[PDB]
Amino acid sequence: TTSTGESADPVTATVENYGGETQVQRRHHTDVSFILDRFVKVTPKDSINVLDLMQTPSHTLVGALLRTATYYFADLEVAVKHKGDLTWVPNGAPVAALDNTTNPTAYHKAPLTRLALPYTAPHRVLATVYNGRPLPTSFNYGAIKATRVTELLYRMKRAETYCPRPLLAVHPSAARHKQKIVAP
Amino acid sequence: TTSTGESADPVTATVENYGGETQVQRRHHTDVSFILDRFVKVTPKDSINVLDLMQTPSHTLVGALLRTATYYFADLEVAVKHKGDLTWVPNGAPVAALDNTTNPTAYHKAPLTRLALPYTAPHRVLATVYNGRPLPTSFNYGAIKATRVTELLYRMKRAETYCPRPLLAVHPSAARHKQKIVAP
Amino acid sequence: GIFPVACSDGYGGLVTTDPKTADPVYGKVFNPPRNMLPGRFTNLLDVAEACPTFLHFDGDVPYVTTKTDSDRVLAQFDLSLAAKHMSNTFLAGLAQYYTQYSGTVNLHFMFTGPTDAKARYMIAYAPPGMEPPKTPEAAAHCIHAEWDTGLNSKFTFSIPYLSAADYAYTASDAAETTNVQGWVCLFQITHGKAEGDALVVLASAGKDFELRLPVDARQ
Amino acid sequence: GIFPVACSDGYGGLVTTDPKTADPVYGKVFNPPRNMLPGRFTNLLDVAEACPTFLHFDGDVPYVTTKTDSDRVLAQFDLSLAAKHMSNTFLAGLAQYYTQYSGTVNLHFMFTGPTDAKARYMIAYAPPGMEPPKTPEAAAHCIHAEWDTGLNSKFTFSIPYLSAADYAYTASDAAETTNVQGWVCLFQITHGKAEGDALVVLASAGKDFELRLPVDARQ
Amino acid sequence: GIFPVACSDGYGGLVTTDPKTADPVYGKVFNPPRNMLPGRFTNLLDVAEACPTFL
Amino acid sequence: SGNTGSIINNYYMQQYQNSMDTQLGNDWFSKLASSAFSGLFGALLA
Amino acid sequence: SGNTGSIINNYYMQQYQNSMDTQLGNDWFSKLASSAFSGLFGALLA
Amino acid sequence: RILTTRNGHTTSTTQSSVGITHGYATAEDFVNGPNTSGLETRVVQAERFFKTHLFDWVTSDPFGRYYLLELPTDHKGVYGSLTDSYAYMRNGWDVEVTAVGNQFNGGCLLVAMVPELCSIEQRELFQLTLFPHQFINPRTNMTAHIKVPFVGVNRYDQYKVHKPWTLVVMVVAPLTVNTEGAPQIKVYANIAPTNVHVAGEFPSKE
């Protein structure tokens, strides 16, 4: 199958050329909303933690797949293990607000506490990369405060991605990347 | 758009005058019943605490927005963290009643205890400001007693407000009021 | 057997704002009938649209007096709900309990001077990104209105909501040097015999003014 | 009485990936309307099919230059998504977050040389179990294609998914000495006056390419 | 209020053979099609009837 | 009406969860704000 | 749409559990990948 | 393969052309949003080409040589003045890049419109084809042509503090003269805005 490469129009040749037969595909596991819905760990800070999806490590499955889209939208679910009373604050609210029990506050109930949070940012859709290294302060879901927070998790809901970006793998030194695979 | 200012009739000019176009509004977040339904902290007293909405601090979101209406009505939800047995009493009942388990009593169950309480006052609608500094003793939802109460919260339900009153913001010294806003 | 169930972790902890109801202790009470009492408001914005309130100026007076000099700038201030001028209004009263807003903010002007004095004014909106205008001739290129005194004493001007993002923060961040929403400027074109005469100004929500995301900021 | 119930053991513990929703704290907010913004993608494979990306070769360049010598092997590498050559592609970018895949992987070739230079190439698939071919005559027995330069500068070749098990691991196990999925080999049959001329290569998912079982491997 | 409930004693303890299902963690996977493979037996007695063995 | 997220009926009777209203025999401010005059008082030119 | 295993309706209103979308006035890449050319550009022999 | 592109009163003609590549969408999204209160306007006279130099592509350039160009750029025409007279703008870009050797030169170029380009990694260039692009292969075409809409987290953007698009041109294969080609190739760009809209007049300097 020959064509003009400079066209950039996608050209997918198939096995039927030399006499194969194309099989059936089931792509559920690569679906954006499916693959990004799960918890990923973020190293917390003792008291105040601004909820931000860019704090996830870049090499994690949720971190990497997030960063491959310039423009992303989703709700948020958090799972927190903390002491005291976990207080949440909406986007753009003053830091002095986190001390008010009137704001949403989850009294400590062991082992941990799970919340579901709406998309609170003013911008129609958020961004992983911004041209203006820093990202604007308006990108965040708000912050949470507690006497101390031991663990923090993010789970995206209804994820939507736009304008894909490079996704890199580990570069082997030898001809292949050889890892020890689970075996009995 | 010129008119007679002394009329006090509301006059709202629009952008279409110089050629703009008015956009669409969604006001859900300013709805009275919506905005006032949430918990707000009140500094308790060791044993007997009379349930009163004016005990909420005036600068809190629920406290301030309450005080902007002369005449308010709503049910009440309380969230209490206490030792012993929390005993509630309806409006206008003697103080000697709080010692009877026959009155509604919530046995201690950790972490805390949440109740829903009806509007118990004799007056058709309560008031934030009364002309007669003190407010009449008949304004209250009753009282609660426990061996000791560590925290107390109020949540208004079905709120209804009448005859609005001034609502003040913080007065800047400089040309603007500059606060540190949450940023990554 | 009996219906099995799974008690799930991370659920059930109390939430101050949670959307569910307490278990009723004490039943069968009837309220004294309150139906159709006067002066009811079900939404805190409607009282903000129907009842404008005064602004705040130097000398702590809710008006600005005509001036005779080369300086025609009558009053100039940021467009924000955290401004010092707006601080006394009812409209900027609700703002402190919400993070974000959108829509139009109306300003009302009423000329108080005697019947033998006449003046002509200009209100203008200076969008962000450039210093606001110091002269009416400079401002004439912005969005503006112009009115003068007469039989009607009151003028009403709608300040548009114009921004990149569909909503704008109520509070003013400390790291913000220059206002994000720009300025509004009030000028005095000229005045007949108006020296020492007062112009009171008022502010109230517009038709499309919308306010969301409640928060308790203290204050 | 009241409806009895049984709190069951081993249920209710929090699960990071569990399929259930948190209890809403704070209600009645409206989003700024975002409808029909440009450039939306709902699935991370569609962006992998519609946007091919470069490979990686010696000298760290995404192309291979024609060579004049007895050695006609232009480039040769494992078929795996963990290969060093694939490492920079977007396609091998998603792989690291999934354990298994199946389906076709397309390769795109574009000849960059001047209009007076002509070459003819061979791509071939060497299945596992035998050493891959070192000469085009040896490879001619495999599955292969052959094309040459001309008006069209680009050729596209679909590498079949051929394996015993219906799926294949993305990662390369350390105890695997020889690739399980075999090799693909790119040869230079001959070249007119093509010395020093570059052939850039690209890779993207095929029609039937399927990827499943998400996992967080670090990386 | 909210729907009241009574947590009952002696219920909910884990039972190795209990007849109920775990909460799914990780969804949307598809199996490689296995339909009509040879030599299937759904019951361990049928293989005992059709294949006698030595004493 | 307020902030409530239950798509299923409340477990307790309406008579308990809340206090029952009675009758006898945004109302005012929305009916006030809806009457705002958006027009021009004088003749329009261009 | 995402990873959700409940065959029964969510206990909380759609308005609470999630943020409500609004309107105004795989989309692109699937419509791009579906247009891929699978054919042969030249004449076929045998 | 003749193609004539007309924007405003300006045109361009290319006898060797591979066609147009439409990035991320065929047509602009909704222009009139809730955030501007309908005070936006379309500027017709601003849509037209303008020309700029990129670099000189020589044999010494290895693989990986790249040139960023951020858009909008300094513009002395009508489009430049708008940026100073209006606090909010939006527009799409119709981009065309031209590198003319003769057909005996060799090597290849990759031009792409990359939204939100900040410090792309060296390895990340192998996947650079993910963005809208066309190859310039002197064997075939002298011209690359790309059309992309306005993208951003806002419906209108302020071009002072934000540049949404970045034109990037990368060398996928190094140049080869082979004695019959041009000794070096100069790369130019011919770019026009599309669907410009503005709001929020500033005051003047006086």
Author numbering:
A (entry chain 1), B (entry chain 1): 1 to 132, 157 to 208
C (entry chain 3), D (entry chain 3): 1 to 219
E (entry chain 3): 1 to 55
F (entry chain 4), G (entry chain 4): 15 to 39, 65 to 85
H (entry chain 2): 13 to 218
Quote what the paper states about this structure.
In this study, we focused on improving the thermostability of a type O virus that is less stable than other FMDV serotypes. FMD serotype O is more thermolabile than other serotypes. We first demonstrated that the wild-type (wt) virus was completely inactivated after incubation at 58°C for 1 h or 61°C for 30 min. The wild-type virus was highly sensitive to heat treatment and showed a highly significant (P < 0.001 or P < 0.0001) decrease in antibody responses after heat treatment both by ELISA at 21 and 28 days postvaccination (dpv) and VNT. Multisequence alignment result showed that alanine (Ala) at 13th amino acid on VP1 of FMDV serotype O is relatively conserved (up to 91%). However, strains from other serotypes most often contain threonine (Thr) at VP1 position 13 (serotypes A, C, Asia 1, and SAT). To elucidate the molecular mechanism underlying the stabilization of mutant M3, the structure of the SDG-purified 146S particles of the wild-type and mutant M3 viruses were determined by single-particle cryo-EM. Icosahedral reconstruction of particles was achieved at resolutions of 3.1 Å and 3.6 Å, respectively. The maps for the viral capsid were of sufficient resolution to build and refine the atomic model.
